[PDB]
Amino acid sequence: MIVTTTSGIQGKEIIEYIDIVNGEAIMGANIVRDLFASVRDVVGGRAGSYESKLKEARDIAMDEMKELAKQKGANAIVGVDVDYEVVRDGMLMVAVSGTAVRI
Amino acid sequence: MIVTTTSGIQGKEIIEYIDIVNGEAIMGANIVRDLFASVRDVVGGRAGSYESKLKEARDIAMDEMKELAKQKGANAIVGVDVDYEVVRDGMLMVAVSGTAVRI
Amino acid sequence: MIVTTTSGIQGKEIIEYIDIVNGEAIMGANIVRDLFASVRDVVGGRAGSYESKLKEARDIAMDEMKELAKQKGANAIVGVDVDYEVVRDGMLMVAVSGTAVRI
Amino acid sequence: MIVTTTSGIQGKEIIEYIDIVNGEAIMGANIVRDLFASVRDVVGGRAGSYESKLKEARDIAMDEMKELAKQKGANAIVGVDVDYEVVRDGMLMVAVSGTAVRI
Amino acid sequence: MIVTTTSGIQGKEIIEYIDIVNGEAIMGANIVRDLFASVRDVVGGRAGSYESKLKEARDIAMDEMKELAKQKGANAIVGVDVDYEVVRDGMLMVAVSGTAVRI
Numbered sequence: 201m202i203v204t205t206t207s208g209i210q211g212k213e214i215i216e217y218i219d220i221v222n223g224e225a226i227m228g229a230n231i232v233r234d235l236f237a238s239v240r241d242v243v244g245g246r247a248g249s250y251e252s253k254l255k256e257a258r259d260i261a262m263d264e265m266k267e268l269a270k271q272k273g274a275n276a277i278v279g280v281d282v283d284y285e286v287v288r289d290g291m292l293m294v295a296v297s298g299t300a301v302r303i
Numbered sequence: 304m305i306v307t308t309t310s311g312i313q314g315k316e317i318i319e320y321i322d323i324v325n326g327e328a329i330m331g332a333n334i335v336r337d338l339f340a341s342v343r344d345v346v347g348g349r350a351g352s353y354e355s356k357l358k359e360a361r362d363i364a365m366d367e368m369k370e371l372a373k374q375k376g377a378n379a380i381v382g383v384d385v386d387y388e389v390v391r392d393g394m395l396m397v398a399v400s401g402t403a404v405r406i
Numbered sequence: 407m408i409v410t411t412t413s414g415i416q417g418k419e420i421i422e423y424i425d426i427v428n429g430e431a432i433m434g435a436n437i438v439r440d441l442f443a444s445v446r447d448v449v450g451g452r453a454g455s456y457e458s459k460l461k462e463a464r465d466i467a468m469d470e471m472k473e474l475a476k477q478k479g480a481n482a483i484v485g486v487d488v489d490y491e492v493v494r495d496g497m498l499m500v501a502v503s504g505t506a507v508r509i
Numbered sequence: 510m511i512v513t514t515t516s517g518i519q520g521k522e523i524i525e526y527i528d529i530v531n532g533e534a535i536m537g538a539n540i541v542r543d544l545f546a547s548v549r550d551v552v553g554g555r556a557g558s559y560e561s562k563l564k565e566a567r568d569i570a571m572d573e574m575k576e577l578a579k580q581k582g583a584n585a586i587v588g589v590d591v592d593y594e595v596v597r598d599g600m601l602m603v604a605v606s607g608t609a610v611r612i
Numbered sequence: 613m614i615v616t617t618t619s620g621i622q623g624k625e626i627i628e629y630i631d632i633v634n635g636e637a638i639m640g641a642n643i644v645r646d647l648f649a650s651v652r653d654v655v656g657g658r659a660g661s662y663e664s665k666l667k668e669a670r671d672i673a674m675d676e677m678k679e680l681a682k683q684k685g686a687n688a689i690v691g692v693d694v695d696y697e698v699v700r701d702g703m704l705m706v707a708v709s710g711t712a713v714r715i
Contacts, residue, residue, distance in 0.1 A: 202629050205691030205711045206619035207309040210626040214313045217305050220383060222361065224354060225347040226339065236699050239640040242665055244672040246679075251636065253345060258634065260347035267349070279308030280632060282709045284697045285387050287339050287395065292699065297385045299308045310412045310516070317416040320408050323468070323486060327460065328450040329442065356448060363450035370452075382411035388490045390498060391443050400488040402411045413515035420519040423511050426589060428567065430554040437550055459551060466553035473555075485514035491593045493601060494545040503591045505514045516618050523622045526614050529692060531670060533663065537651045562654055569656040576658070588617025594696045596704065597648050606694040608617045 201266060202276040202303070209276060209303055216302035218274045222295065223265030225257035229290030254294070258282070261296045274300035304369055305379040305406075312379060312406055321375050321403040326367030328360040332393020339395075357397070361385070364399045377403035407472060408509070409483040415509050422508040424480045428501065429470030431463035435496035442498070460500070464488070467502040475506035482507040510575060511585040511612070518585060518612055525611040527581045531604065532574030534566040538599025563603070567591065570605045583609035613678060614688040614715070621688060621715055628714040630686050635677030637669040639704045666704075670694070673708045686712035 202209055235250040245251040269277050280298035287293060305312065338353040348354030372380050383401035390396050408415060441456040451457040475483050486504035493499040511518060544559035554560040570591075578586050589607035596602040614621055643665050650661060657663030681689050692710035699705045 203632055204629045205632055205693065205709065206629075207311070208313070208619060209629060210620065217307045217309075217312060220306055220308060220365070220385065222358075222385065223348060224357065225345060226342045226351065226353060227345050228342040229340070231344055232699070236638065236703060239638045239703065240642065242637055242639050242643070242669045242672060245634075245636040245676045248636075248638065250638065254636065255634070257345045257347075260345065260349070262632070264347055264349045279383075280711075281308065281385065282632070282634070282693070282695075282707075283387060284695065284705075284707060285389060285395070286697060286699060287389060288336060288392055289700060291339050291342075293339075293387075295385075295387060297308065299306075299383075310414075311416070317412075320410050320412075320415065323409055323411060323488070325461075325464065325488070326451055327454075327457070328448055329445040329454065329456065330448055331446040332443065334447055360448050360450075363448065367451045384411065384488070386490070388492075390438065390490075390492065391496070394443060394445060396442075396490070398488070398490060400411060402486075413517065414519060423513050423515075423518065426512055426514055426571070426591075428554075428564070428591070430557070430560065430563065432545065432548045432552050432557065432559065434549045434551075463551045463553075466551065470554045485516070485589075487514065487591075489591075489593065492595065493593070494541060497545055497548065499593070501591075501593060503514060505589075523618075526616045526618070526621065529615055529617070529674070529694070531667070531694065533657045533666065534654055535648060535651045535660065535662065536654050540653060566654045569654065573656050573658050573663075590617075590694065592694075592696055594698065594704075596698070597645060597702055600648060600651060602648075602696075604694075604696060606617075608692075 205280045207279050212303040214301050218272050218300040221265050221269045221300045222297045223261040224295045225260035227257050227292045232292045258294045261294050265296050269300035272300050276301045276303045307381050308383045310382050315406040317404050319405045321377050324368045324372045324403045326364040326399045328363035328397050330360050330395045335393050360397045364397045368399045372403040375403050379404045379406050411486045418509040420507050424478045424506045427471045427475045427506045428503045429467035430501045431466035433498040438498050464500045467500050471502050478506050480506035482509045513587050514589045516588050521612040523610050527583050527609045530574050530577045530609040531606050532570035533604045534569035535602045536566050541601050566603045570603050574605050578609035581609050585610045585612050617692050624715040626713050630684050630712040633677050633681045633712040635673040635708045637672035639669050641702045644702045644704050669706045673706045677708050681712035684712045688713050688715045
């Protein structure tokens, strides 16, 4: 199913704006305590060890929103937003939102 | 009513831009520290304990915004944003914004 | 005057993109303490005493931006964004931004 | 040159998408303290003594972004975002972003 | 490849929305703490010492995202977002996102 951070799907028309949908996943204090504290210079995502866990939580959040959108009978999510929140300095949450849509 | 994170609604053009509407809900420190401090690795909202409360908060904020838009005579909200704010060590505030519109 | 979180005003043409405009309002550590950090479970905006103040602050920010756009001879604000920031230990800023425009 | 938080410029087609450009400015710990610490209830931008240094930090970030755009051959910036980040304990950073464009 | 905040590339047709892509880089506590420390009043980037490693970080995040879009078969990135998160005790992450697209 098509997911996009744009407001539309070029060439396709939206017949239905079904609902705003969301997904999240949380990374515990211990995981974020060490994979991020290991960083000493400017370390990118390929090189660093923090990315696969971050990407894992982001994909969990993505698929939750996808599953929710699909189970509402949508065939696209537009206007997708990706947000990161560090709750009590340890709990890094990744939240996704967007509009479940019929095209 | 129709709510969308997108700048417009396709096929139904906007007759009047009424106002910027908002809604919020706050999760208390005890509850945030309680349920969000869970997870020892990476856990989604789909299979968690914190989501239920986060989704409760998000839905309240959403309901508030739609109600306010109703009151203002709106029959759609476009350009919707869902953001999150760690207001203290504890609290998370979910804030929703968007433009109350009549189509 | 027309303020929208959308990129345009349907049916009307933007003649000039005059400037990016801003408004802020800051909430004191005591006010955030007493009203915001009191919340124990989940409290929405209609039920929380925090709201009248958050709305007051947000309305101050919005009015400050509108007037500043008025100063510049604009008759529209487009691409409006609402932001919240913990600016000092215990303090809360609402910052609004947008594009002052002539339709 | 033209700067806008909207996703485009009306009536003026984009010839080239040159680069995403960025600007920042930072206020010292001292500065945040002396102008924010004093705030008690709700204090807006027009009235607040904090507003001139903040607007100065923002205007510096903007100028630096505009200057980089100009150096890249651009004559407009579109999709401008304004960010506030408490970077060290005491200090506030204002970061701006957008796409440097040719119209 | 073309990277843009906009949802479309003017005079170019998006023939596939491939995937939402992401890039990150993290600045460790050292070069955050003892490199933003020199800030006094209000200091801009191209006059401060800090627009070196901060920019370097952004470029790594962007380069990561672009490289991932390339591996997915994309030849442009649209709806791009630049985010900043303080991740721990004085640690700055720049996270970028966008939709990997075929034009």
